[PDB]
Amino acid sequence: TEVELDDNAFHKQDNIFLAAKNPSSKWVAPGSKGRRRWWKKIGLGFKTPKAAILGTYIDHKCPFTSKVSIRGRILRGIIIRHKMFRTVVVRRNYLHYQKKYKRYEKRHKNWSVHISPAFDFSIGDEVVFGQCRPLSKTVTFNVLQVVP
Amino acid sequence: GITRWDLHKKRATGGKRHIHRKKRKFELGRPPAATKLVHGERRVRRVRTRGGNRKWRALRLSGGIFSWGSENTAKHCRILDVVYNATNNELVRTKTLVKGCIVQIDGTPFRNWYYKWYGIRLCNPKRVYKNHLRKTHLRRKQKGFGLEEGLQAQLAVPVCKILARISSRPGQDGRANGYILEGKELEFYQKKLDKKKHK
Amino acid sequence: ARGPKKHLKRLAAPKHWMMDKLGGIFAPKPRAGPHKSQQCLPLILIVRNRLKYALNYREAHMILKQRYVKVDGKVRTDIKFPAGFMDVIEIPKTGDKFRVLYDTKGRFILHKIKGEEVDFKLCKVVKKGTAKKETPYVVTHDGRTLRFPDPNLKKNDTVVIDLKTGKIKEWVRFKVGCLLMVTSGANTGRVGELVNRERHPGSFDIIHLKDAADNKFATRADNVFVIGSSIYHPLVSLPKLKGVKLSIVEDREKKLAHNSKKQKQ
RNA sequence: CGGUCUCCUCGACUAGACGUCGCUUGUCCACGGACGAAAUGCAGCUAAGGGAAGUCGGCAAACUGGCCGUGCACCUUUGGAAGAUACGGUGGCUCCAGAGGCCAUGGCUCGUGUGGAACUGUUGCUGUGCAGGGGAAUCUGACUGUUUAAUUGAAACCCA
RNA sequence: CACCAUGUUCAA
RNA sequence: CCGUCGUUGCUACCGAUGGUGGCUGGAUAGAGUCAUCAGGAGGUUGUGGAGGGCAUCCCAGCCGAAAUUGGACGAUGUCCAGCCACUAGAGGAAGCAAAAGUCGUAACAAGGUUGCUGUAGGUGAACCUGCAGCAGGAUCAUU
RNA sequence: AUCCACUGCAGCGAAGGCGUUCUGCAAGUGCACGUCCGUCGAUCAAGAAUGAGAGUUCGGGGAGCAAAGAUGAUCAGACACCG
RNA sequence: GGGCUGCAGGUCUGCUGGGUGGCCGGUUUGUUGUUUCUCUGGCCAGCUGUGUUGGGCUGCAACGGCUGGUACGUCCCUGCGCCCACCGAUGGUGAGGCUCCUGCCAAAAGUCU
RNA sequence: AAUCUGGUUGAUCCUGCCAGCAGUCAUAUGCUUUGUUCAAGGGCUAAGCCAUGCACGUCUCAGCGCAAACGGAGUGACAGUGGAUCUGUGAAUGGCUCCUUACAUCAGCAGUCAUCUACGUGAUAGAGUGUGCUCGGUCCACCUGCAAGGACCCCAUUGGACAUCCACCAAAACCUUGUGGCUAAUACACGUUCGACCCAGUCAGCCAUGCAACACUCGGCAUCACCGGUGGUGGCGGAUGUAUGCCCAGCUGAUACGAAGACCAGCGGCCGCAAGGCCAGUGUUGGUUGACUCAGGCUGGCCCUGGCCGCAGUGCUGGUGGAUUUCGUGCAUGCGCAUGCCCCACUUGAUCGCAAGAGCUUCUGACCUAUCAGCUUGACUGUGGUGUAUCGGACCACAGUGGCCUUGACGGGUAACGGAGAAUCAGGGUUCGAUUCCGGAGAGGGAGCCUGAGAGACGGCUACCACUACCAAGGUGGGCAGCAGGCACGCAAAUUGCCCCAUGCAAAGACAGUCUGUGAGGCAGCGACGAACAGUA
């Protein structure tokens, strides 16, 4: 789906040298066909998707297979829509308490969040997304878990 | 001057942003180097930066250090010409050296080097040492040895023009270093060159 | 036009310096030395306001540039040198020998000490890195480097350095049961043994401490300071209340009794 | 030099049965010649500085002019006004994209039809012929159509 | 069940 | 007690025709600077040779100003468009206020034609009339 | 054109509104019930559908009544009540 | 859920309409009298002891002065104390680890029955 | 103090407002005003305009002293003081103001694993270095260079300027300026042996021993061909001993769950005289984080005689002061022979942290307005680059069609700088906050820059605009929303004061001999803003 990229350049992974004569088994994964893949385990109590570890897609701005570090807030939202490429709109309906009238308001916030190609998701699924460096004008969060 | 801030860039909504300050120096930009491939002399202008540090605008570079990744060689190899760029052909036409542009380089080193190292002559040319014979045959008999069919078909023409990709940012370090393409990236860019030679 | 600010207003001064708000518009802005600006005493405050040798700013400059105020075994002539926690301040012409510590109220007191107590210092490891040529070092809270520590000296430990040689003499682990002192937050200046460390990966771990008598408080792991392997072996002399904070009714009664028994004469 | 019925109708530029030039066909016939050829005239052009001060009256001439892109106000019978007003571009060359068809994803044909870029020139390109000046009101006839062949084309007649 | 309009200003 | 009408004053509205100020956007020309392409005034070192060290020359090198080309940033002028704010106006038309001006008596009683509502027409002014409704009516009530 | 009397502390309709008889057309409420579904509901900016009479539009109709108008009285006036 | 062994009151049980004071619990305040105990400085027996002066501290102690003079067991209710229902885990390494047990058979008696 | 009272009527009870009553660290004003102590004070309007003066300079023993400027004193390089000057460093802080600005600023929270850094502080630091050598520089050799070959030299420390000064001066001036001659460095340029040693590695050679007739070759012939050479294992070694930053590429930066055999090569060890069999021994590579492509480390980045690079950088100064005894053997040991020692500070610079800052970024939280309902087209995402200190449409090229919106988008308004806070406040709340502390913005409006660690600086420069000052008409200038002060504008707001005594800041700088500066700040003057305590008996 979004594993597809442009055919204007040869998209390779940064830290994997594809023409190594005698490479090591450090990135030979325990379920792959010998395909070497650099990945990491972001470590705030999250699990690296098997799709990321054993996949073929190339994604900078992916938190598992690229230099993008997850640090800062980690929020929970709902996928409003997926109409950008590898980016997805996420909404947080929260309740803001007005002090004078001792009641609450329905408020919301959207986020252009970056879904890596390691995540299966349908529109409406819940998402936990952690903050990364600015990846675009509005994108500064990566999707760390999709919950059906 | 050239400002890399977003107080002019409208809100993500689409709403205008009213600027109530003027341009700070810490968010300036400088004009692109637009490093040109030039046969002969190199031009490099030092640029005083945010902490009194140096950047090096490469104007008119000629060559650079190019690495043979599988071989760990890194010879200085005199870029011949920009052949492919990822997106815009204007930089290919005007011979602009930018990172990740594909170039033909001399490659008579990595050939004389291949001989010196392995004792293997790649093209019919167009005292002898016992220890040297021994070491060359040892490096031949090592494990991962073997020249690939896409690299030797290039190193076997009498005027080598090997395909490298530029890895440095010449407008930032004043260098046109890079790496020779090997395997699937070589096949990719050779296929692009085929496509635009035939179409 | 903006760069680094050079002044510190008297109101914006750290409150743990009992700076009087009417005695001047400015306060001496600490220099960027070993200790943090809000966890430090300027040498002018130690010389003029506490140990009133200097009657004012001019005489403080005089005393200090005459090169006989020694802080951590070396002379410091900067009137704004940020002397901080666990530093030793000697004045030889006077025979003064202090270690600057925290009282239970969270202020910097100058605890008078003796020979061996002045000939070494106690500093907590905050960072552990490797420099070029494979040199393992450990950056401490006094900002010093200690370019070759013992390999089994992990981060939050404390170290006993000899202020003469500036090398490491001992070190004390941060495991549960160690005697410990608080150096920030509301509970600063209180001494209590470590009971348990609650982990909070990605944020601040919390440390639960049992006071010398039986009280219990909590603080942050970057807020604690190890002093001693246990409540039996403190690696340094300790002030009058020995880090045992009193209740506020107890403190009020203590002040009242002191004032009354003093007025008695 | 007026008028008078129908048929055929090439090439280039072009939107073209406009306009300009050319093959085929036809023709050099209109009373001529000298003299740079007065004044005046009828025609074609220009004109500094000003710009309707000329005149009953901007009459006459001039300005504008094709196409592409952006864009366009009052008022309105909601249809218009509108090409409103206005702004930018336009050559030459070298390229880059871009649509289709046939034989069998290769051979061949293949956008005179578009967009972009680089270079270029004494800033200049609808380079010639051709080719709206525009805006704001009052009176009036709704409109389109009609009209005194040979002084009045109108506000007249007609219309729905 | 013809027609029957009006009453200067403040003060009470 | 209501409405024309009369007097004086104040407030806002409509009004041919305008005026001023500000902001934003576009177009056009474009100061200065930054970057680039050039340039080399001038200053200053060396090459051995032949004159026995002197502008001897040659050949070179280094620094280097003005000027040149040109990308950017962009002041500013002019035009255009939109918007907003303030403001002049012949005339028209309202509202309000001010002891004792004029014409009526519409309303308050069945107010002398019950009153009022919606709409339409007429009229010096209140108002009158039609249609339908209402009682807040002058009827809580008659095979 | 309109459906008197019957015609009411009567009924129906979301309201406006609805009254001779036979008849076509679809509908609603209530009631009865060991029928079905299983929360599918309440109120509602925007939006939508009905909405007396007056008024307008196009084509007919015109008895009666009746704005405007005419007109005779009444009146000080009376393009007011009344005819 | 049954319950209730077991503290106070309530279910129960019989009462109380006497007028002052000092003494004693406790030290309650200005006093003395210690010195438990660090600390201080030398001397003295080859920096440790040993008595000591100075203030610290109170194991406290009195002196005037003192003020302070409802009950057992029984049916259950909470604070707890119990018996009686049915069907997050695991795997490695250390830590500059702790605790307990720890050579052979086993009388009688002991336990599960 | 959980508070009410007067007003509609002939009287009554309500709704409802008006008015009263109270307050304000709100402003203005009228009359009146004795003392002591505190205290706001050109914010509202005109971020309008400014005459004059001052507000940023700085020197120690410790960068440069041949000024006779003052001066002790004698064969002396400089005694000392010392204006000046060059150099360094500061002028980016402070002070003022609130015009702008509506998720903007700001507050609290958080991130930089996306970054920069002068002063400060803790550590650090071994560059004759493009090939093994020729090759740090000269002196000889051999043959399209060599594989082991030599004699010296470098180490008592460089060069050229321009200042102050003298002299001639252009100009009406100008905080405008030319020229000639000396003369300094911690200025500028330039230079670096002994600051290493060893090891890795690179080149070359040699040894011991072993299967073998296979491959590729050196030697003889125009691909059919006949004899040598290299291979495996275990070692030794002659040449050098590639220091570090930036840049590019490759490698590393582990593992923390678990069972046994055969065989063929080699390598060990065991039984072994050996043959041969065999497996009992068996020590001779990893930091940080929650997470990393991070830290750190390794390797390559000279080639076949010119060519190419020249990979830019880093030398604890070719520095300064004070002190003073610098022998290599002085001490000693064992008997001069062999070994451990034989000034202290300051300071230019490089690296790594820390500290102190900054930039950017996160989450949540702002007023009125629908007589503002649709807004946006670099607009939203992506790939590849550029630029930056760094992430990023920040910019570009190519792709796509997104992004926000009645949970109020976009627009408009400012009796909008934000907050800490202020006034009331039973409770809930209402209103304000130009103003001292923090943050932002600005310096007449704009914009562009240089220097520097830091500025889009304005008591810096450049230009345009609006005003404006001097003039000898050619030219030169200006920037009080710093402190006083003036004109305007207004209802409306102070002295053209003294001083660094206190508080601080800066600098090449403790204090004094010998005046560092500071309109920051303090103290005074004016000051019924506003507070507290007394008198007028």
Yes or no: say if B175 and B65 are a contact pair by the CB < 8 Å rule: yes
A103 lies within 8 A of chain B by CB: no
B70·A18 Cβ contact <8 A: no
Cα four-point dihedral sign C244, C249, C255, C256:
negative
Write the residues followed by a gap in chain C (C–N more than 2.5 A). none
Report the 3 state secondary structure along chain C: CCCCCCCEECCCCCCCCCCCCCCCCEECCCCCCCCCCCCCEEHHHHHHHHCCCCCCHHHHHHHHHCCCCEECCCECCCCCCEECCCCEEEECCCCEEEEEEECCCCCEEEEECCHHHHCCEEEEEEEEEEECCCEEEEEECCCCCCCCCCCCCCCCCEEEECCCCCCEEEEECCCCCCCEEECCCCCCCCEEEEEEEECCCCCCCEEEEEECCCCEEEEECCCEEECCCCCCCCCCCCCCCCCCCCCHHHHHHHHHHHHHHHHCC
C-alpha span between A72 and A133 (Å, rounded): 10
C-alpha span between B11 and C188 (Å, rounded): 46
Return the number of other C-beta atoms located less than 10 Å from residue B10's C-beta.
Answer: 10
Which residue of B83, B89, B182, B190 is the best one to mutate when testing the A interface, meaning the one whose CB has the most A CBs within 10 A?
B182
**Listed residue (A138, A139, A140, A115) closest to A125, CA to CA:** A115
- Tell me the two tokens of residue B140: 């031949």
C-alpha span between B95 and B97 (Å, rounded): 6
Solved how? Answer: cryo-EM
Resolution (A): 3.2
* Contact partners, residue C247, CB within 8 Å, separation at least 6: none
Side-chain-facing half-sphere of B138: CA atoms under 13 Å: 6
Question: Which of the nucleotides in strand I have any atom less than 7 Å away from a protein CB atom?
Answer: 91-95, 100-104, 110-124, 146-147, 203-206, 230-232, 244-255, 287-293, 295-297, 299-304, 308-312, 351-366, 375-407, 409-411, 428-430, 436-443, 446-449, 451-458, 501-506, 509-511, 520-522
Cα four-point dihedral sign A52, A53, A56, A57:
positive
Instruction: State which amino acid sits at residue C176.
Output: V
**Any idea how long chain C is?**
265
B10: Cβ under 7 Å from strand D?
no
**Listed residue (A143, A54, A43) closest to A90, CA to CA:** A143
B59: three-class secondary structure by DSSP: strand
Side-chain-facing half-sphere of C144: CA atoms under 13 Å: 19
List of chain C residues whose C-beta atoms are within 8 Å of the C-beta of residue A44: 201-202
**Listed residue (B63, B30, B26, B52) closest to B170, CA to CA:** B63
**Listed residue (C101, C96, C94) closest to C114, CA to CA:** C96
B59: Cβ under 7 Å from strand F?
yes
Chain A nearest-CA residue for C202? A44
C-alpha span between C31 and C78 (Å, rounded): 8
Instruction: State which amino acid sits at residue A12.
Output: K
Question: What is the distance in angstroms between the Cα of B184 and the nearest Cα belonging to chain A?
Answer: 8
User: Least CB-CB distance to B70: which of A9, A21, A138?
Assistant: A21
Yes or no: say if C126 and C139 are a contact pair by the CB < 8 Å rule: yes
- Tell me the two tokens of residue B54: 């140096």
- Tell me the two tokens of residue B169: 């940012």
C-alpha span between C149 and C153 (Å, rounded): 7
Please provide residue B33's backbone torsions phi and psi, each rounded to the nearest 5 degrees: -65, -45
Question: Which of the nucleotides in strand D have any atom less than 7 Å away from a protein CB atom?
Answer: 95-97, 117-118
Yes or no: say if B67 and B91 are a contact pair by the CB < 8 Å rule: no
Yes or no: say if C98 and C114 are a contact pair by the CB < 8 Å rule: no
Residues 1-40 of B with CB under 7 A from strand F: 1-2, 30-31
CA distances from C6 to B61, B178, C58 (A): 46, 47, 19
Helix (H) or strand (E) holding A145: strand A141-147
Q: Using only C-alpha atoms, what is the Rg of chain A?
A: 18
Å from the C256 CA to the D3 C1'? 140
The residues with which B58 forms a beta bridge, in sequence order, are: B44
Pairing mode of beta strands C82-83, C88-91: unpaired
Yes or no: say if B119 and B135 are a contact pair by the CB < 8 Å rule: no
CA distances from C112 to B46, C47, C96, C245 (A): 57, 15, 8, 20
**Any idea how long chain B is?**
199
Q: State how far Cα C147 lies from the chain centre.
A: 23
CA distances from B81 to B77, B90, C100 (A): 12, 14, 69
Instruction: State which amino acid sits at residue C223.
Output: N
**Listed residue (C180, C190, C179) closest to C239, CA to CA:** C190
Instruction: State which amino acid sits at residue A133.
Output: R
List of chain C residues whose C-beta atoms are within 8 Å of the C-beta of residue A43: 201
Question: What is the distance in angstroms between the Cα of A138 and the nearest Cα belonging to chain B?
Answer: 7
**Listed residue (A91, A136, A92, A147) closest to A114, CA to CA:** A136
Q: What ranges in chain B are assigned the alpha helix state H?
A: 90-93, 112-118, 130-141, 152-155, 170-173, 184-198
Which residue of B89, B99, B184 is the best one to mutate when testing the A interface, meaning the one whose CB has the most A CBs within 10 A?
B184
C-alpha span between C150 and C78 (Å, rounded): 33
DSSP state of B140: H
Helix (H) or strand (E) holding A52: helix A50-54
Q: State how far Cα B23 lies from the chain centre.
A: 35
Residues 48-107 of B with CB under 7 A from strand I: 48-57, 62-63, 65, 67, 69, 72-76, 78, 85-88, 90, 98-100
Å from the B91 CA to the D120 C1'? 20
The residues with which A74 forms a beta bridge, in sequence order, are: A130
Chain A nearest-CA residue for C200? A44
